[PDB]
Write an enzyme that holds these catalytic residues in place. Sequence first.
Site, PDB file in Angstrom:
ATOM      1  CG  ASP A   1     -44.270   8.426  16.304  1.00 22.25           C
ATOM      2  OD1 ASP A   1     -44.488   7.561  15.416  1.00 22.25           O
ATOM      3  OD2 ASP A   1     -44.059   9.623  16.044  1.00 22.25           O
TER       4      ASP A   1
ATOM      5  CB  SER B   1     -46.281   3.435  20.048  1.00 16.19           C
ATOM      6  OG  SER B   1     -47.375   3.122  19.226  1.00 16.19           O
ATOM      7  CB  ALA B   2     -50.076   1.788  22.941  1.00 17.86           C
TER       8      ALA B   2
ATOM      9  CG  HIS C   1     -44.790   4.140  14.870  1.00 16.71           C
ATOM     10  ND1 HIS C   1     -45.258   5.060  15.781  1.00 16.71           N
ATOM     11  CD2 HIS C   1     -45.191   2.931  15.318  1.00 16.71           C
ATOM     12  CE1 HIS C   1     -45.902   4.433  16.745  1.00 16.71           C
ATOM     13  NE2 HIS C   1     -45.883   3.141  16.484  1.00 16.71           N
TER      14      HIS C   1
END
Length: 263
Positions: A155, A128-129, A243
Site C-alpha cells: 500500500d 505505506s511510507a 490500508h
Amino acid sequence: SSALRDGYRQAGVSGRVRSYLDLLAGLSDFREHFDGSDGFSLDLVDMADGPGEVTVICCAGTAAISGPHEFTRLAGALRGIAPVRAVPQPGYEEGEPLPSSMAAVAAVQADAVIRTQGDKPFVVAGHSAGALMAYALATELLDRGHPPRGVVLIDVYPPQDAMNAWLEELTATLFDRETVRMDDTRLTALGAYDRLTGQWRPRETGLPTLLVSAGEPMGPWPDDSWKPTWPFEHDTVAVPGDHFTMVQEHADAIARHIDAWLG
Ligand SMILES: [Ca+2]
C-alpha cells in the site's frame, strides 16, 4: 498524554493534519541527528524462522505508532514459510538520533542488513511510507553490491491524492490502533520522516517489485484512482482489507502472496 499527542488528535478532528505534520518536522530539526558517517549503528530484529534461502526483511513504518511490532502478525503468518527480520527506523525510541537525510538512514540500515545477512539472499518489504523506506533501503543495498532478490511494497503511495484526502480519517484510525503509545519522541520522528519521504524521489533499480494493494478504500471514491501505485515496473496483487487492516487482520493473505512470489 502530551501536548504533542493531544494536538495531533485535534489536527485530525479539525482538518489541519498537513499543518501539524509540518510543525512536527520543524520541531524535529532541534533534535540530535546522524548523517551516516558519524558511527551511529542499529540492529535488525529476528521475527520468525522458515525454510529456503530468502529472508523477508520488513522495514518499520514512519507513523507515530510504527515499529518492528507492526510485522508481528505478518511474521506469525510467515513462520515456517520464510525467515523474517525487521529493520527499525531510528529516532522513534529514546536515545536514538534522527537521520539528516534519506541517505543517512538507508546507509546505517544497509550496514545492519549486510552485517546480518552476509551473502544469504533476501527481499525487503514495507507498508505505506514504510514501503518508501523499504525501497530506499533496497536501492542503497543494490548500490553496494548486495541487491535484494526483490521488494514488496504494501500500500505504497509515492510522491498521494487519496492519502491527502484521507489525512483526518488516517489520523483518527491511528489513535484507534495505538498499540504503541505516541510519545513526543515518536511524534517528532513522524515529522522528520514525513518530510524526508515527502521530498525524496525513488530511483529506477530494475529490482523485481511486488505491489500489495488494499482491497478497498477507507472512504468513497468515484473511480479507481484511490489505489496505491508505483512508477516503476512491478507485479501487483490485491488482498482483503483497507490500508490498515490489510497488514494486520489480513496479514495471512499477504503472507500467502509473499510465499507464492518467493516460489
Ligand atoms: Ca557528520
